[PDB]
Amino acid sequence: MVLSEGEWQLVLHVWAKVEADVAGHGQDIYIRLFKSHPETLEKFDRFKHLKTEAEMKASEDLKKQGVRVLTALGAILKKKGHHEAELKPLAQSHATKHKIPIKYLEFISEAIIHVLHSRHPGNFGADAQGAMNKALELFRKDIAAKYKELGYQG
Ligand code: HEM
Ligand SMILES: [O-]
C-alpha cells in the first residue's frame, strides 16, 4: 500500500508532539500495552516481573526502552515508506531474538493509537488517526513480509 504526502504530513505533525517528551509517551504506551494485552509483557525478560502500573512508571530501564522503540519507529515514519534499511535489523531481531508475533505488533499499534488519541486531540482527529493507522499497517505489512523471508511465521 502507499500513503499520500498529505497522509504522511498528518503522521509527522502528531509525531512532532510526541517528540516534545518521547520518554513520557513511551511509558504511557507500554503501560497501555501491558494492561490491555498482559501476555506481551512475558516477552520481555528484563521487565516481565513488573506487577503494577506504578512499578512500570518507576522503571528507569523500561523508560529507556520506550525511548529506543519510539525513536526507531519515528525514524521509520520519517522515511515515509522508504524504510527498507531500517526494517532489516528490526525484523531480524524481532523474528529471531525476541520472537514477536505480528499479532503483538498489532497490539502495540493499538496502544500507540490509544495514547495519541488521548494526549493529542489537537493533532489526532479522525483524518490524522486514519493516516497513522495506515502508516502502522504499512510498517506491519512490510515487517511481516520480512519475517517470512527470514523464516518466521509471525
Ligand atoms: C512499533 C513496534 C516496535 C518497535 C519499533 C520496536 C523497536 C525495538 C528496538 C529498537 C529494540 C532494541 C534493539 C533490538 O533488539 O532490535 C527493541 C527491543 C525489544 N523489543 Fe521491540 N519494538 C517494537 C515492538 C515490540 C513488541 C510489540 C514487543 C513484544 C510484545 C517487542 C519486544 C522487544 C523485546 C523483548 C526487546 C528487547 C528489550 C530489552 O532489551 O529488554 N518489541 N524493540
Ligand atoms: O520494544
UniProtKB/Swiss-Prot annotation:
Positions that bind O2: 65
Catalytic function, reaction form: Fe(III)-heme b-[protein] + nitric oxide + H2O = Fe(II)-heme b-[protein] + nitrite + 2 H(+); H2O2 + AH2 = A + 2 H2O
Keyword Nucleus among record annotations: no
EC number(s) stated in the UniProt entry for this protein: 1.7.-.-, 1.11.1.-
Positions of nitrite binding: 65
Residues binding heme b, per UniProt: 94
First-tier enzyme category under EC: oxidoreductase
Subunit structure and binding partners: Monomeric.
Listed name of the protein: Myoglobin
Organism for this UniProt entry: Physeter macrocephalus
Lineage: Eukaryota, Metazoa, Chordata, Craniata, Vertebrata
Gene: MB
